[PDB]
Amino acid sequence: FVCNTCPEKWINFQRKCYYFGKGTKQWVHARYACDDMEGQLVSIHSPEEQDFLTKHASHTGSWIGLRDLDLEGEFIWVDGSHVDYSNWAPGEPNNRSQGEDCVMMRGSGRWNDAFCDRKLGAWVCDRLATCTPP
């Protein structure tokens, strides 16, 4: 009936749980780290979800679950969903023809693209919250 239960060290917002990771990681690094924890690198689909992430975001930048796929020819989230909501910094993205294929979130919450082998100090995972029983 009510789904706001999250594992130790994760934070609940709406029906989801979020892990604000800290550590030195390239994008595909953070992708597998989230998978190891039974989550996914975060997908963002509304301004309310973004505003929650901004309140907890590392000041020095974080990987999120968006990257440019060559065959589909667009940015696609790790869970296969398309970009509806977006929060690009003004002028972004600007490195698609330039090999900057992975997306990070600044301390402001705004997104920019980057080289996938860039090292950042933070990354965010999500998973679904579990629910109250009968």
Numbering used by the authors: 158 to 291
Paste lines from the article.
Immunoglobulin E (IgE) is a central regulatory and triggering molecule of allergic immune responses. IgE’s interaction with CD23 modulates both IgE production and functional activities.CD23 is a noncanonical immunoglobulin receptor, unrelated to receptors of other antibody isotypes. Human CD23 is a calcium‐dependent (C‐type) lectin‐like domain that has apparently lost its carbohydrate‐binding capability. The calcium‐binding site classically required for carbohydrate binding in C‐type lectins is absent in human CD23 but is present in the murine molecule.
To determine whether the absence of this calcium‐binding site affects the structure and function of human CD23, CD23 mutant proteins with increasingly “murine‐like” sequences were generated. Restoration of the calcium‐binding site was confirmed by NMR spectroscopy, and structures of mutant human CD23 proteins were determined by X‐ray crystallography, although no electron density for calcium was observed. This study offers insights into the evolutionary differences between murine and human CD23 and some of the functional differences between CD23 in different species.
